[PDB]
Amino acid sequence: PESADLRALAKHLYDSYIKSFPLTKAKARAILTGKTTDKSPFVIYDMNSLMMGEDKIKQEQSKEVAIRIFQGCQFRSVEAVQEITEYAKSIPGFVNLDLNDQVTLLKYGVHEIIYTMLASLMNKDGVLISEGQGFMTREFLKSLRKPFGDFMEPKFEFAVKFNALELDDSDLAIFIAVIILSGDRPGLLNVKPIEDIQDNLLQALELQLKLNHPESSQLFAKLLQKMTDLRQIVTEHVQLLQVIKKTETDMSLHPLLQEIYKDLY
């Protein structure tokens, strides 16, 4: 009835997720645990490893190694800001919202979405990089000189907790959508149509988690709670970005990322 509608939307959003995101949790986990045919990830654990595996990998690459890692990261984010916009668009209702609201919800929303989905590429020991081809140990990342050695460790700490909910891509696709339609972003002009859409998402999310994870009591509330940390990691992430800007050079900053950062606080 309405239940069937909720299942329908849950499938719409999953299909779309699968379409918008080249690298799914299903695949990430198959690589991480080596349950695959493709050769294994090339492992960067030190500066020697960094050097050889460097070549076969996803501008001004005359920068030190931390900055080239950082800018490798940020350029992947730019592609990710685009994959996510295309997904937001698939959410029913979304593209009918005031366009200034679609901009805002994306401005404030993409970093929460990025680190949620990047958990799916992490274990407590490293992240998988370049569509699965390489694997950057968490250690090698802590060893990068300040402030770069600080970027990712709060990510891995969140992900290790997040990953313990054991969500799959079907679950992630509604949660992510729930994150984008957040009525509490600053400077939203029309809060009610966005909440009207998120409320239906939430309903869909709750039936998915119970259908999909019957034994896993209060999974919905625990998952929503994670929207709590996340709201945080993001903040210590924006500051960390200011500290790069305060302390670091002429560094190129992509225009798209400029727009997201411009006046977001």
Binding site: L99, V103, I260
Partner: peptide, 12 residues
């Protein structure tokens, strides 16, 4: 402003 976002948001 934010033209690059509006740009992605409106491409079909």
């Amino acid at each position: 402003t934010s033209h690059k976002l509006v740009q992605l948001l409106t491409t079909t």
